[PDB]
Amino acid sequence: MQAIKESYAFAVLGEPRYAFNFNHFDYVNPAAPKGGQITLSALGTFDNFNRYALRGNPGARTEQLYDTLFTTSDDEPGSYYPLIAESARYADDYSWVEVAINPRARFHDGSPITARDVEFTFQKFMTEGVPQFRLVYKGTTVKAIAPLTVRIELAKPGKEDMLSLFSLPVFPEKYWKDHKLSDPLATPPLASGPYRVTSWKMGQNIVYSRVKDYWAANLPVNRGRWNFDTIRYDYYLDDNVAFEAFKAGAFDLRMENDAKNWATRYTGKNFDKKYIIKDEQKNESAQDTRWLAFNIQRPVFSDRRVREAITLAFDFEWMNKALFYNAWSRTNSYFQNTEYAARNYPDAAELVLLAPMKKDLPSEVFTQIYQPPVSKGDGYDRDNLLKADKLLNEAGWVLKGQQRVNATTGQPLSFELLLPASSNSQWVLPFQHSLQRLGINMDIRKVDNSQITNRMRSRDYDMMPRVWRAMPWPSSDLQISWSSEYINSTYNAPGVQSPVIDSLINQIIAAQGNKEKLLPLGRALDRVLTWNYYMLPMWYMAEDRLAWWDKFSQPAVRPIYSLGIDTWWYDVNKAAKLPS
Amino acid sequence: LGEPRYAFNFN
Questions:
Q1: Which of A185, A253, A332, A499 has the smallest count of CB within 10 Å of its CB?
Q2: CB neighbourhood size of A106 (10 A)
Q3: What phi and psi values does residue A331 have, to the nearest 5 degrees?
Q4: Of A78, A129, A480, the CB nearest to B4
């Protein structure tokens, strides 16, 4: 007989940490007091409240308006605990699940959350949501089989596809029947989570208020969290004006991403009087990485040799020494600072995966360890710039006077770097200068936060900066960013459609939830994405650099996978010592 | 964790 399990917790790999006697997370103070305000910054602008629309610039925190069936811990890579759901019954292969809904679950108007709301929400995403949703869940059904029981059926085993539906926002049918999911919202929707939007000024600020009768305030996943009565976001057009406003006391907390600020500008009266706390902690976890995307769909970047040559022109060791107080580490992996990074020679298991595709792979996948270019540190590395010239000439881009031109057509080699106006970009003129010394013209275009969002989504760029978010294991979400059928998802930055990538990702999906198969699959995929030079690696830091006005207290333990600001509380005794 | 399945990219 097929075996049916019942559980209150789930993990993508291995067992959940809080599987027995779960009262509260290890990284909270269960007795944290309620009250007070935290004021935060955001860069750019916003114009609507619907995170799920096909267009628009959504407001800060609008991805957290709704509770979900299960919620994740912040000290584990992928573990799920009860929120709207109480429990689930499931097939051994996770191809079906029956979820029991908490009878106390409520929306902000005091109306119940039911199995019918879950069924409605799935149909709303399938018919009006972003196009990738109906592709991923093709063949899946979600049905209310009793008032408080929802049954999910997949056409294939997909542990991770099931868990992903546990994170879907649960929408109220009584509100959303009257609004298309694809349209931006000028006013906040009817919602359910521990904070509600109570005031705003479009493009300028959003104010969230704590829901003081929140139905789920005493569930284990919520104990010690959501302590502030008010969370306010103020918008700034660039990071320099934001930093000066922080030091003047206009907002309470700053994550410092600029090396020169951290090294030289945490000075003055407010630091002398210890009104502002500075904190640096090592992070030993998966790391967000910075890259410059090449649009490989445009002729200028269609040849791997030209992408290799432009990468050789980027002098990281000079930038880190001259500009950035040797603060940064070079990006070198799509699984940075994990066991899945390809930092050794391929082993026998990786060669079984890669050998059949040898005709469609760079030879170095088999013979070398991927290493971004290293310079002497002076801006004029002779060996790297001579190699760039060699590759450009082979690709048919040759010097005529001082400019590089196509050997067949005479067209100059030129491209546009698209940048947010909001960013610190001290690296951009140095890179322009290096390219000019190779005869390559790079035009710089700085644009506002609405324009960068629209053009990033449509791939209307030659080159633009992208962040590759930390991925602690090779997830089935990789298909959205890299597989051919998901090219228009807004997550495929280079525009790649490769049968090699498609094959490795199909094998990762088939190995969902199996770590021993996923280790060589992740390393094999890392080698294909890095050796093709689809993006130009920039930098990362495995340290979190934070500063705050001294009005807060924190639990003794910080979570591994987030900063845990939602565990902080307002400390009336510390706050009393600050200027008013 | 599923987030790219249900919303467009936003920096």
A1: A499
A2: 18
A3: -60, 135
A4: A480
Is residue A324 within 8 Å of A260, Cβ to Cβ?
Answer: yes
* CATH assignment of the domain containing A322: 3.10.105.10
Distance, in Å, from the CA atom of A558 to the CA atom of A565, rounded to the nearest integer, reads: 9
Q: Which of B5, B9, B11 sits opposite A133 (nearest CB)?
A: B5
Q: Which of B5, B10, B11 sits opposite A132 (nearest CB)?
A: B5
Q: Per-residue b/e over A272-283, b at no fewer than 16 CB within 10 Å?
A: eeeebeeeeeeb
B-contacting residues in A 423-452 (Cβ below 8 Å): 452
CA distances from A425 to A330, A382, A480 (A): 17, 25, 29
> Looking at CA atoms only, how far is residue B9 from chain A in angstroms?
6
Asked if A167 lies within 8 A of B9 by C-beta distance, the reply is no
Cβ atoms of A58 and A189 within 8 Å: the answer is no
Please judge whether A491 and B2 are an interchain contact, meaning their C-beta atoms are less than 8 angstroms apart: no
At A450, the amino acid letter reads S
Could you tell me if A309 lies within 8 Å of chain B, comparing CB atoms? Answer: no
The reply to whether residue A163 touches residue B10, judged by beta carbons under 8 angstroms, is no
- The alpha-carbon gap from A102 to the nearest alpha carbon of chain B, in Å, equals 23
Confirm if A433 and A461 have CB atoms less than 8 A apart: no
Instruction: Identify the closest residue of chain A to B7 by CA–CA distance.
Output: A52
A477 chain-B contacts, CB cut-off 8 A:
1-2, 4-5
What resolution in angstroms does the PDB record give? 1.5
- How far apart, in whole angstroms, are the C-alpha atoms of residue A115 and residue A121? 10
CB A438 within 8 A of CB A415: no
d(CA A154, CA A143): 12
Say how far apart CA A283 and CA A277 lie, in whole Å.
19
Q: Under a CB-based contact definition with an 8 Å cutoff, are residues A420 and A295 in contact?
A: no
- The C-alpha of A128 sits at a distance from chain B's nearest C-alpha, in angstroms, of 11
Domain containing A387: what range?
289-540
Facing residue for A130 by CB, picked from B1, B2, B6? B6
A167·B8 Cβ contact <8 A = no
**Method by which the coordinates were obtained:** X-ray
Is A480 an interface residue toward B (CB < 8 Å)? yes
Q: Are A112 and A105 in contact (CB under 8 A)?
A: yes
- Structure tokens that stand for A205 in this block: 């600020």
C-alpha distance from residue A20 to each of A17, A89, A101, A221 (Å): 8, 18, 21, 14
In sequence order, what E strands does A211-302 have?
230-236, 253-255, 276-282, 289-294
Give Cβ neighbours of residue A357 (< 8 Å, ≥ 6 apart).
A500, A503
